[PDB]
Amino acid sequence: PDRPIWFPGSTPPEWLDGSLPGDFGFDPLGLSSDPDSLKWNVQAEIVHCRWAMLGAAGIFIPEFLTKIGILNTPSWYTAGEQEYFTDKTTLFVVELILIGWAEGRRWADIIKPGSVNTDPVFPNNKLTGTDVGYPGGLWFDPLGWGSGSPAKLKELRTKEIKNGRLAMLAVMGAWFQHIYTGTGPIDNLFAHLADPGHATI
Amino acid sequence: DTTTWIWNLHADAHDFDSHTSDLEEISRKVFSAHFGQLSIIFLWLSGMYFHGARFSNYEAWLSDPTHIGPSAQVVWPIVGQEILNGDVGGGFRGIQITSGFFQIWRASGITSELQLYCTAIGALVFAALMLFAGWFHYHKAAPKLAWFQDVESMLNHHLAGLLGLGSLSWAGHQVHVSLPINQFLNAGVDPKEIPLPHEFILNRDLLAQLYPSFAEGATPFFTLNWSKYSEFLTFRGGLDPVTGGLWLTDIAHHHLAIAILFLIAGHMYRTNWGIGHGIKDILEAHKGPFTGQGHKGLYEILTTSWHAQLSLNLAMLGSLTIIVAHHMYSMPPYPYLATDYATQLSLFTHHMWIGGFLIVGAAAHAAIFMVRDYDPTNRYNDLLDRVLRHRDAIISHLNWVCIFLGFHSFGLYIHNDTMSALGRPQDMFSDTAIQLQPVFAQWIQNTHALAPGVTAPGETASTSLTWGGGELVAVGGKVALLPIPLGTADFLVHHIHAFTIHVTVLILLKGVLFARSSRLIPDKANLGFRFPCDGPGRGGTCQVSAWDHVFLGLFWMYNAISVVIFHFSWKMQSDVWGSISDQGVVTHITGGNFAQSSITINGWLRDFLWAQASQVIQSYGSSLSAYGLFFLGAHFVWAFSLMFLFSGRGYWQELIESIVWAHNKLKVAPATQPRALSIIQGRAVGVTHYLLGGIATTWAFFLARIIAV
Amino acid sequence: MRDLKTYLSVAPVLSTLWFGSLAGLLIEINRLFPDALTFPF
Amino acid sequence: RPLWFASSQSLSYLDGSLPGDYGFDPLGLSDPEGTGGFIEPRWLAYGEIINGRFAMLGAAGAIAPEILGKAGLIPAETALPWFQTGVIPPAGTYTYWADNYTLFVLEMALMGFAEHRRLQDWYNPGSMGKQYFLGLEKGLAGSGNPAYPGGPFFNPLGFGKDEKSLKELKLKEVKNGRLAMLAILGYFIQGLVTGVGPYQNLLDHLADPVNNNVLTS
Amino acid sequence: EFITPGILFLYIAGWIGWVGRSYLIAISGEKKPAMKEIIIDVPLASRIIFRGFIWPVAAYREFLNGDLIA
Ligand code: CLA
Ligand code: CLA
Ligand code: CLA
Ligand code: CLA
Ligand SMILES: CC(/C=C/C=C(C)/C=C/[C@@]12O[C@]1(C)C[C@@H](O)CC2(C)C)=C\C=C\C=C(C)\C=C\C=C(C)\C=C\[C@@]12O[C@]1(C)C[C@@H](O)CC2(C)C
Ligand code: SF4
Structure with missing residues (x-):
């Protein structure tokens, strides 16, 4: 009720x-407004945040190592044009099948929770998670950090969500920076740091 | 429950008086609806301005107005429809437009496609602003009733501010931009070499070179030495020889004078400061010699009712639109408009139909006011009561005039036709056997021709070239304007117009007067403004309401307007439009056959309808084939309308009963029970299709005929 | 909101969406297989 | 009164x-x-009140650079009239450490923070002292009157301890604000008509009062 | 020319008719079945749409059982 709000002095929504x-x-x-929409949107935000952390670290870290002189990997924009051992559509089909099994299992978990918590072929192995979107278990939570006092879980989930929002913004920014200036994201940062006053538009 | 609810939902969507009985809420809804309409109009203007910038040959036309056909629409090549992209010239392919937008832009000084883009963006911004203003003024800050009833302040602002200042601002724009750019264009200067409009404002010697009076500055205006401004403020009259339109200096002077007059006229009605008249006092104190008591009681009627005001405004706007249509073909205001015949024919027909529709609307809303808002107890007015107390004498006399005019205008045509068929051409009403000359119109023409130099010392030429006595005007080898003769053929058609107008007036006025009650149904007011009948009693009481009177009057309005446009088209094609050879011989399009062929009904069927329709029916395979396709489609709609007009409701309900049985047999029976259309709805559907078919047929015929020749 | 979904499911809007998608599809085949009178399969 | x-x-x-x-x-x-x-x-x-305060700032700010330029206190490169300092690019520009648009963005951000806080205080009173804002929420509580917030941040010198002094100072403030708004309107009109700096207009009028008037222009 | 496109049209029209018939029967048992004919139940309609793929078999089996005609 008294938590900080996005617009101080305003009234937060009742839902x-x-x-x-x-x-916030x-x-x-x-x-x-509706509870089902709330749950679906929460799951969507969590998935987007995790995919964003995965992708954002994979774009700026390689370019930083390339510009610093350690590697020679090409720009992330043109990585879809490089040579590979097979046609990209075959890779697309394999990816589609694997991610299809994974996302279908996840979808079955959302609609009817607790229905996919057992190994289909080795009934001994299970997953110990209790909330939707946080599977837990040995496969995904090896270090045991996912269980504890509710305050610790709330704080950890809050920091994860905030990092995710930052990563999503950064990924969109990298895309638009490269569509506009026509160079790598790190080059833009170095150009800005060289002359912050003038090196914009 | 049933299907009539769906139809009733859209029928009462904009009837705010039925939803609520509070005047304040109706006024607020009306304000917001007006804002929405303004937004839609601005969006339409933005689209029109944008399309001419990206998908048009405006520049090529600007470099050669006479030999290039204007175009602003282009078709995608999907199903072979790209055949509609004709060769309009200028290295461009598309559909030729007839709305006269290029002439407006040229007369406004536009030379490139960059200004049109800016205008389109501005119009889009204005549309968004209007939409937001409507939302705000309905949901956030809604005015009170006392604000709407301050009609003394509304008139002052709508006269001085909206009309007084708009004319002054437009005169300023004309003086500063339109005159020099048009002078440069008329001098043969290539359009891309003309200086930008702001160079005239920034650099003053450039303007001084064209007009020396600009070197003196604004001092002669303050010193009352107004004769120095005569370089660009003239009183010439007549058409411009180079372009064929009115002189732009005359238009600038006219707008300046109009602005000053309106600004003076806007300071009449009283407001907080106590100077000026009050409308109520003017109405009450007025008592002439035959009125007696006067107009006491009209202020409350006109300030407490929306339908009376709507009726009055609709009638005035319709009359104004008809006047505008008449005044633009004879005194062409834009350059290169008179010699471009496709646009001239299209602009005259559009505004006539608009005016007719608005007049019929005025009649309908007067009937609505009489049915609903009339109150002799609280809002008694004397003149309305006296008009209602002798309505039998008004209608019976108007009924007689219609019969007399119809006989003496149509029997002449029938007599001519019979005498022609019997081999007796010396007994017809024509210029060779029995002459019925319109002497008064000819006297008016002579007086107006001779008025300059005697009764108008400041005029160098007549106002228009239609009055006999002027000289022919030729632009690019085509005929722009010349005196129009009047003969026996023009005597009959004018009386046809009078007869049709009188019949329409009779129908509408009878409906309005007998809206409240009649000798047949004394309690017709309680039945409502829109009810089908009162049963088969008294021999039959079908279509006794005022709505049915408007429904009948629409047919006669359509009948009356159609004859006007046919008269205009044939008279202009046969007597004015044409071409001139190098030696000065005029050859009209149809060679002057209106004088002898337009006196019998066979002449209109053979020489007009049969002869001039060969262009549309041969348009297949060419870029004009869309007109040929629309010609046949409109006949289908017109003939389809007759199913609803000729038939009744019981037959279709029984047919739907059998159909519903067949559906029930297979468990596909809808829970919303099908119902045939109501009695009133069946009438409304028929007339809509009738008018649509007729107007579309005439539209396609005219447009296909005049573009080709 | 729920009202947004309820207004979107009304008959006119749903019918317009369906017919627009249908017209787009039909134009797609007419563009991909133009001037067709017989089945060559 | x-x-x-x-x-x-x-x-x-x-x-x-x-x-x-x-x-x-x-x-x-x-x-x-x-x-x-x-x-x-x-x-x-x-x-x-707000327009008066901004006008009293602007009336001195626009004429300050011209006052010192004639006296030699500042370099001539910065002694520009109020309409040649980059506000109107066609009328002339000056090259600062950054171009005009990033300065515009920075100004918009800072004043957006300030004005949104002020507006939120106007709508509901006293709510700007509740949420934590870098520990500065203690002094931004306001005083219940939107135009006179008071407090340590806005009234550091402790003026107007008594109501009579406060009323007299308010009256003087509003009078100065009205005068400044009139002065700013005069600034705009003189700049549009004569085409030179207002201090130049005053100097020209003082040099020959009988000649440099409105009548000759 | 005619035989091959004819069967395709018959299949498509049967699909449309079967879907339309199956939607009405589902909502007929409600307290106010007329309300579902204006505000279309999209989640219910999406399930029936896939069922029209096998309309020939469905209609053939329903005709034999006697449930086709009321
Ligand atoms: C994490 C967010 C983030 C960050 C740090 C940057 C950083 C930068 N951007 Mg950028 N950008 C972003 C998001 C971001 N962008 C997004 C989402 C878009 C798409 C709209 C763009 C589109 C964009 C263009 C088109 C250009 C840059 C450029 C630049 C560089 C020069 C600064 C400038 O003019 O930016 C201006 C930035 C904006 C107009 C976007 C607004 C800022 C977003 C909304 C984030 C809001 C600030 C954030 C909350 C601050 C907290 C994070 C902080 C630790 C950095 C600089 C390295 C320029 C360049 O290449 O340098 C030469 C350039 O031309 N950006
Ligand atoms: C027919 C149009 C129309 C009419 C009759 C009204 C009538 C009214 N409006 Mg209003 N309004 C309109 C259009 C209209 N508005 C539009 C299009 C907008 C933009 C969204 C607004 C925004 C608006 C606001 C925000 C407010 C009103 C308010 C009011 C009410 C009080 C007005 C008053 O006392 O004067 C006050 C007049 C002034 C203070 C003078 C302002 C002078 C303006 C700024 C000059 C306009 C410059 C113009 C753009 C120059 C064009 C140049 C050219 C290049 C185009 C009054 C009932 C007020 C109210 O209380 O509502 C009940 C109110 O707060 N209106
Ligand atoms: C400023 C103009 C104006 C205004 C504000 C009104 C306002 C009103 N009129 Mg009205 N009217 C006008 C002009 C105007 N009229 C004119 C000029 C005429 C003469 C034709 C009429 C004739 C008229 C009649 C006969 C009646 C009204 C009625 C009414 C009231 C209810 C209207 C309603 O529910 O419409 C609802 C809107 C519609 C039904 C939409 C009509 C759709 C048209 C006919 C079809 C257009 C076809 C189109 C070209 C093709 C589109 C294809 C697309 C669908 C795919 C309302 C107060 C009614 C009334 O007060 O009854 C008590 C009434 O009975 N008016
Ligand atoms: C899916 C609904 C549906 C079904 C199964 C039928 C079935 C039938 N109709 Mg029929 N009809 C319908 C809707 C339907 N109708 C509608 C909406 C109308 C009003 C336009 C009619 C008007 C109508 C007439 C006038 C006649 C029939 C007749 C017939 C029978 C002859 C076969 C035939 O196709 O006629 C041809 C049917 C048509 C030409 C109707 C047009 C098809 C419409 C446009 C399809 C609408 C589908 C609808 C949108 C379903 C939405 C489903 C969605 C919720 C998932 C047959 C039993 C005839 C008969 O034997 O006497 C009863 C007959 O004379 N119908
Ligand atoms: C991050 C992201 C996508 C990530 C992409 C990845 C992983 C890419 C990976 C790769 O790069 C690698 C690693 C290597 C490359 O070789 C290949 C690719 C494949 C290219 C999505 C979304 C990124 C960004 C998103 C989702 C933007 C968010 C939008 C917002 C803020 C909306 C907010 C509001 O909805 C609220 C909250 C409330 C409403 O009332 C108002 C509004 C304003 C509508
Ligand atoms: S049922 Fe038809 S014909 Fe009979 S009175 Fe009524 S409207 Fe007239």
Whole structure:
């Protein structure tokens, strides 16, 4: 009720009571008035944030090592044109099948929770997660960090969500920077740092 | 429950008086609806301005107006429809437009496609602004009723500010931009070499070279030495020989004078400061010699009712639109408009139909006011009561005039036709056997021709070239304007026009007067403004409401307007338009056959309808084939309308009953029970299709005929 | 919102979306297989 | 109290609670009847005060560079009139450490923070001192009057401890604001007509009063 | 020319008709079946759409059982 809000002095919506991690009462359009919409949108945001962390680290880290002089990997924009041992459509089909099995299992978990928590072929192995979107278990949580006091879990999930929002923004920024200036993201940073006043438009 | 609910949903969508009985809410809804309409109009203007910048040959036409056909639409090549991209010239392919947008842009001084883009962006911004303003003024800051009823302040602002200042601003734009750019264009200067409009404002010697009076500055205006501004503020009259339109200096002077007059006229009605008249006082104090008491009581009627104001405004706007249509063909205001015949025919027909529709709307809303808002107890007015107390004498006399005019205008045509068929051409009403000359119109023409130099000392030429006595004007080998003769053929058609107008007036006025009650149904007011009938009693009471009177009057309005446009088209094609050889011989399009062929009904069927329709029916395979396709499609709609007009409701309900049984047999019966259309709806559907078919047929015929020749 | 979905499912809007998708599809085949009178399969 | 073109209608609602009220309202914009939108007496008074403060800043700011330039206090490269300092690129520009647009963005960001905080205080009172803002929320609580927030941040010298002194200072502030708004309007009109700096206009008028007037221009 | 495109049209029209018939039967048992004919139940309609693929077999089996005609 008294948590910091996105717009101080304003009234937060009645469907955001602050229970969810990373909640700042930001929903001017009211896109999640209904509970089912709230749950679906929360799952979508979590998945987007995790994919963003995965992708953002894979774009700036290689370019940093390339410009510093350690590697020679090409620009991320043109990585889809390089040579490979097979046609890209075959790779697309294999990726589609594997990610299809994974995402189908995840989809089955959302609609009817607890229905996919057992190994199909080795019934001994199970997953110990209890909330949707956080599978837990030995496969995904080897270090045991996913269980504890509720305050610790809430804080960890909040920091994960904030990092995800930052990563999504950074990835979109890298895309638009390379579509506009026509050079690598690190080159843009170095050009800006060389002359912050003038090296923009 | 049933299907009539769906139809009723769209029928009462904009009837705010039925939803609520509070005047404040109706006024607020009306304000917001007006804002939405303004937004839509701005969006339409933005589209029109943008299309001419990207998909048009405006520049090539600007370099050669006479030999290039204007175009602003291009078709995608999907199903072989790209045959509509004709060779309009200028290295461009597309559909030739007839809305006269190129002439407006040329007369406004536009020379490149960069200005049109800016205008389109501005119009889009204005549309967004209007939409936001409508939302704000309905949901956030809605005015009170007392704000809407301050009609003394509304008139002051709408006269001084909207009309007074708009004319002044346009005169300023004309003086500063349109005159020099048009002077440069008329001098043969290539359009890309003309200086930009802001160079005239920034550099003053450039303007001084064209007009020396600009060197003196604004001092002669303040010193009352106004004769120095005569270089660009003239009173010449007549058409410009180079372009064929009115002189732009005359237009600038006219707009300046109009602005000053309107600004003076906007300071009449009283406001907080106590100077000026009050409308109520003017209405009350007025008592002439035959009125007696006067107009006491009209202020409350006109300030507490929206339908009376709507009726009055609709009638005035329709009359104004008809006047505008008449005044633009005879005194062409834009360059290269008179000699471009396709646009001239299209602009005259558009505004006539608009005016007719608006007049019929005025009649309908007067009937609505009489049915709903009339109140003799609280809003008594004397003149309306006296008009209602002798309505039998008004209608019976108007009924007689229609019969007399119809007989003495159509029996002449029938007599001519019979005498021609019997081999007796010396007994017809024509210029060779029995003459019925329109002497008054000829006297008017002579007086107007001789008015300059005697009664108009400041005029160098007549206002228009239609009055006999002027000289022919030729632009690019084509005929722009010349005196129009008047003979026996023009005597009959004018009386045809009078007869049709009188019949339409009779129908509408009878409906309005007998809206409240009649000798047949004394309690017709309680039944409503829009009801089908009152049963088969008293021999039959079909179509007794005022809505049915408007429904009948629409047919006669359509009948009346159609004869006007046919008269205009044939008279202009046969007597004015044409071409001139190098030696000065005029050859009209149809060679002057209107004088002898337009006196019998066979002449209109053979020489006009049969002879002039060969262009549309031979358009297959060419770029004009869309007109040929629309010609045949409109006949289908017109003939399809007759199913609803000739038939009744019970037959279709029984047919739908059998159909519903067949559907029930297979468990596909909808839960919303099908119902045939109501009695009133069946009438409304028929007339809509009738008018659509007729107007579309005439539109395709005219456009296919005039573009080819 | 829920009202946004409810207004989107009404008959006119749904019918317009369906017919627009249908027209786009039909134009797609007419562009891909133009001037067709017989089945060559 | 003195009355300046006061009217019977205007005197009905302009009792005198506002500072520097003279009863002048020929158009009756602030009439308490039919109040809506931005036509509200409280909002109108607030707008007048804020416009007056900004005008008192601008009237001195526009003429400061020209004053010292003639006296030799500043280099001639920075002694430009108010319309040649990059505000109007066609009229002339100056090259700072960055181009004009990034300066515009920085100004927009900073003043957006400031003005949004001020507006949120206007809508609901006292709510700007609750949420943590780098520990500065203690002094930004306001004083219940939107135009006179007070507090340690805005009233550090402790002026107007008594109500009489506060009222006199408010009256003087509003008078200075009105004078400054008139001065800024004069700035704009002189710049548009004569085409030189206002201090240049004053010097030209002083050099030959009989010649350099409106009549000759 | 005619035989091959004819069977395709018959299949498509049967698909459309079967889907339309199956939607009405599902909502007929409700308290206010008329309300579902204006605000279309999209989640319910999406399930029936796939079922029209096998309309010939479905209609053939329903005709034999006697449930085709009321
Ligand atoms: C993580 C966010 C992020 C960051 C750090 C940067 C950083 C940078 N961008 Mg950039 N950008 C972003 C997002 C971001 N961008 C997004 C989302 C877009 C798409 C709209 C762009 C589009 C863009 C263009 C088109 C260009 C840059 C350029 C640049 C560089 C010069 C600075 C400038 O003019 O930026 C201006 C940045 C914007 C107009 C976008 C607004 C900033 C976004 C919304 C983030 C908001 C600030 C953020 C909350 C601050 C907290 C993070 C902080 C630790 C950095 C600089 C390295 C320029 C370049 O290449 O340098 C020569 C350039 O030409 N950016
Ligand atoms: C400023 C102009 C104006 C305004 C504001 C009004 C306002 C009004 N009129 Mg009205 N009217 C006008 C001009 C105007 N009229 C004119 C000029 C005429 C003469 C033709 C009429 C004739 C008229 C009649 C006869 C009646 C009204 C009625 C009404 C009231 C209800 C209207 C309604 O529900 O429409 C709802 C809107 C529609 C039904 C839409 C009509 C659709 C048209 C006919 C088809 C157009 C076809 C189109 C070209 C093709 C599109 C294809 C596409 C669908 C795919 C409302 C107060 C009614 C009333 O007050 O009854 C008590 C009434 O009965 N008016
Ligand atoms: C899916 C609904 C549906 C079905 C299964 C039928 C079935 C039938 N109709 Mg029929 N009809 C329908 C809707 C339907 N109709 C609608 C909406 C109308 C009003 C336009 C009609 C008007 C109509 C007439 C006037 C006649 C029939 C007749 C017939 C029978 C002859 C076969 C035939 O195709 O006629 C031809 C059917 C048509 C030409 C109707 C047009 C097809 C419409 C446009 C399809 C609409 C589908 C609808 C959108 C379903 C949405 C499903 C969605 C919720 C998933 C047959 C039993 C005839 C008969 O034997 O007497 C009863 C007959 O004379 N119908
Ligand atoms: C027919 C159009 C129309 C009419 C009759 C009204 C009428 C009204 N509006 Mg309004 N408004 C309109 C259009 C209109 N508006 C539009 C298009 C907008 C933009 C969204 C607004 C935005 C608006 C706001 C934000 C407010 C009003 C308010 C009001 C009410 C009080 C106005 C007053 O006392 O004067 C006040 C007049 C002034 C203070 C003078 C302002 C002078 C302007 C700034 C000059 C315009 C410059 C113009 C763009 C120059 C064009 C140049 C050329 C290049 C185009 C009054 C009922 C107020 C209210 O309380 O509502 C009840 C209010 O707060 N209106
Ligand atoms: C979602 C997103 C943007 C967010 C949008 C926002 C803020 C919307 C906000 C609002 O809704 C709210 C909250 C409330 C509403 O009332 C208002 C609005 C305003 C509507 C960004 C990124 C979204 C999506 C992201 C981050 C995508 C990641 C992409 C990856 C992983 C790419 C990987 C690769 O780059 C590698 C690694 C190597 C390369 O060689 C190959 C490829 C394949 C290119
Ligand atoms: S049922 Fe038809 S014909 Fe009979 S009175 Fe009514 S409207 Fe007239």
